């Protein structure tokens, strides 16, 4: 509780320190405190009868019990921030501290769900194994929680990947899959809020599209839903843009990359399922719950989305210049756009 110790830890854990042994040492201090306190509490409770007759009935102490909680509330936030470190030992120790905290319920769980989700995409297997197991335990007790922090999850995930360098976050979808409302909402949120009119970084769009194509599906309702809304937005937005370009430019480069990425996602989906355009246009949202219950057949080795999307990102890659070659690439992009709108 002392002020100097407080400021000491809250400076070492933050402030972009050169040392990486101080941070490891701090996290190890917290970890050993938590473990030792837990063991002491348990093994001191086990032998009650020797001291029972000499303890009050009207007191019900808390300062010996609540203390272990209070401590965390002074440091917790900083520890969570330490997930975004380039070293690996720091990340491992931070995850150990959080997984010792939560397993005694000391702190409120749904404020450290997003970080615990973005920790689901590390290379080392033991890391994300521990993380995902912690997540399924957080869910199995409390039904709602994960649905509250789902998009912030992916945002933190993308920040983690840009700090380090199937689907990376497929597990999250497996957890949120069951409920029709939840799933539907989540999909619409991510899609409508990231591609249509948000000036998001051209890399986050790539990442979202990669994850939208990779996701494990176990019915037929989901890709048809995605395709349907994709259709509507593509139609309106693309039509407006292309017709204004015909009436008539880096802004075009940006919005064109957006719509093109969305196009290629649609095409990869349609090729991975091989569904007839008639069936797609026939389907409407909430037509019936049980009609599209068939398991989607998958053609082997049709994954061309990664290569294709990287090719079309290499076409742009935030490259605007006062040179003839980019103008040529842009006119080809426009003719390609006409071809895309002509796809049948």
């Amino acid at each position: 509780f002392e002020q100097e110790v407080k400021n000491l830890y809250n400076n070492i854990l933050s402030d972009k320190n050169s040392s990486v042994n101080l941070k490891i040492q701090v996290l190890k201090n917290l970890q050993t405190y938590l473990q030792e306190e837990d063991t002491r509490m348990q093994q001191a409770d086990r032998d009650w009868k020797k001291v029972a007759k000499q303890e009050d009935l009207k007191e019900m102490g808390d300062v010996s019990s609540g203390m272990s909680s209070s401590i965390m509330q002074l440091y917790l936030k900083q520890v969570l921030e330490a997930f975004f470190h380039t070293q690996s030992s720091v990340r491992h120790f931070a995850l150990n501290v959080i997984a010792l905290t939560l397993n005694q319920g000391l702190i409120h769980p749904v404020q450290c769900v997003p970080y615990l989700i973005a920790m689901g995409t590390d290379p080392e297997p033991a890391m994300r194994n521990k993380a995902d197991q912690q997540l399924v335990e957080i869910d199995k007790k409390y039904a709602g929680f994960i649905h509250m922090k789902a998009v912030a999850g992916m945002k933190m995930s993308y920040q983690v990947q840009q700090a380090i360098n199937s689907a990376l976050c497929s597990h999250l979808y497996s957890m949120i899959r069951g409920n029709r409302q939840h799933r539907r909402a989540f999909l619409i949120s991510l899609l409508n809020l990231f591609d249509d009119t948000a000036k998001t970084d051209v890399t986050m769009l790539l990442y979202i599209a990669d994850n939208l194509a990779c996701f494990p599906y176990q019915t037929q309702e989901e890709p048809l839903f995605i395709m349907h809304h994709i259709d509507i937005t593509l139609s309106v937005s693309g039509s407006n843009l292309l017709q204004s370009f015909k009436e008539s430019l880096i802004e075009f480069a940006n919005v064109s990359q957006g719509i093109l990425l969305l196009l290629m996602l649609k095409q990869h989906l349609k090729n991975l399922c091989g569904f007839s355009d008639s069936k797609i246009q026939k389907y409407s949202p909430s037509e019936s719950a049980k009609v599209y219950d068939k398991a989607i057949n998958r053609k082997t080795g049709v994954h061309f989305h990664p290569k294709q999307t990287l090719d079309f990102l290499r076409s742009d890659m935030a490259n605007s210049k006062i040179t003839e070659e980019v103008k040529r690439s842009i006119v080809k992009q426009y003719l390609d756009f006409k071809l895309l709108m002509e796809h049948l």
Binding site: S69, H108, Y142, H147, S189, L193, V236
Partner: protein, 390 residues
């Protein structure tokens, strides 16, 4: 300002004309069972307007004295307070019932309901919101309220409920326009394909139709975005104020430092459309769902939520009616200490209680006693308590 005094006549077991004494900053209303004090709270709940079902009597005619026994007393009733704020003026609200109907009066001038309401809203009493009247069993209920009702309350208090019909009407308009644009686009595409397979008039028809539909869609889009932005901004302001203050308030009220309370929404892009939930941690225990917690923590949690909601937008007074239903002497002492430490310069608070540890800290008492008759006729008499030690 505050609530100076009220006046009853024939209303719900208060025969004759009598003046309830002037109210100090923090009073208490003691008395033995069946004396009829909690309906005095109903009296306060009747001036400010309240649906009859919450007044624990059907049909609104059984308010007049002596109806539940079988013989009424008159065909009138007359309840009226005198709100007094700084500036040496005094306003007198009333609400008289005749036959079945009810008429409202301000300063002995007949008015219509809407202006009466708006006058109260000017004062600061969101009558339909009901964030400051607690009935006997309501306090426990507030903590366990289903998320939907809590969203309803938070939308009511914050003036973001009036903008509903406009919003979803705009929503339906834009969804229809978008569907029709897609329809026309695909029809034009298939007509183009059937043309290339080889008609002209149909092509131009669907083209012009698609153009008109697009224009209407764009007309719907920005307007929907405008109204949704409005509702979101208002709701979000109110909600963030409540959240920060509930955390601080709960820590202060439990006189500990290991308690948390998280007031969190679902669907955090449009919080007004989905239920909000409330999870609190005990003073010295683990995180458990709200249902599991014992009654003693439940009542402190509900008190925390009430005080936070009030601490966003002020309300001149409370009416607490037996909040100490289940609290032990220590917890009641803590709650009473907080009420005393807050009551001076923040809000007037009038409580009904039985445990002497709650009306001992009080500063002015109002005894309420019965008298035998054709029906139990109640009467009132006051007592000062700021001329005594400890």
């Amino acid at each position: 300002g505050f609530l100076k005094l009220i006046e009853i006549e024939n209303f719900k077991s208060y025969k004759g004309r009598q003046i309830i004494g002037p109210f100090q900053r923090f009073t208490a209303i003691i008395g033995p069972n069946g004396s009829g004090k909690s309906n005095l709270m109903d009296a306060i709940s009747f001036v400010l307007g309240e649906k009859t079902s919450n007044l624990r009597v059907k049909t609104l005619r059984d308010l007049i004295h002596g109806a539940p026994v079988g013989k009424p007393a008159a065909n009138r009733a007359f309840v009226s307070m005198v709100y007094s704020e700084e500036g040496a003026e005094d306003r007198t609200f009333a609400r008289v019932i005749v036959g079945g109907s009810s008429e409202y009066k301000i300063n002995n001038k007949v008015v219509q309901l809407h202006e009466y309401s708006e006058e109260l809203e000017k004062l600061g009493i969101l009558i339909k919101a009901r964030n400051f009247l607690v009935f006997q069993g309501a306090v426990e209920s507030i903590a366990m309220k289903n998320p939907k009702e809590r969203t309803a309350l938070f939308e009511e208090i914050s003036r973001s409920g009036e903008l509903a019909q406009e919003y979803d009407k705009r929503k339906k308009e834009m969804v229809k326009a978008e569907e029709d644009t897609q329809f026309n686009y695909h029809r034009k595409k298939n007509i183009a394909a059937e043309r290339k397979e080889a008609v002209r008039d149909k092509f131009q028809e669907t083209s012009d139709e698609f153009e008109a539909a697009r224009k209407r869609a764009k007309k719907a889009k920005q307007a929907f975005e405008q109204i949704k932005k409005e509702r979101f901004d208002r709701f979000n302001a109110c909600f963030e104020s409540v959240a920060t203050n509930i955390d601080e308030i709960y820590k202060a009220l439990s006189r500990n430092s290991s308690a948390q309370a998280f007031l969190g929404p679902e669907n955090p892009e449009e919080p007004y459309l989905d239920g909000i939930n409330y999870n609190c941690v005990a003073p010295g225990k683990r995180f458990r769902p709200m249902d599991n917690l014992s009654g003693g923590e439940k009542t402190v949690a509900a008190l925390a939520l009430l005080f936070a909601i009030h601490s966003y937008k002020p309300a001149p007074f409370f009416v607490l009616d037996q909040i100490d239903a289940a609290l032990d002497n220590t917890n009641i002492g803590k709650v009473a200490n907080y009420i005393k430490e807050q009551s001076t310069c923040n809000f007037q608070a009038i409580v009904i209680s039985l445990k002497e540890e709650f009306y001992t800290k009080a500063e002015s008492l109002i005894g309420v006693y019965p008298e035998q008759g054709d029906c139990v006729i109640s009467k009132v008499l006051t007592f000062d308590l700021t001329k005594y030690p400890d």
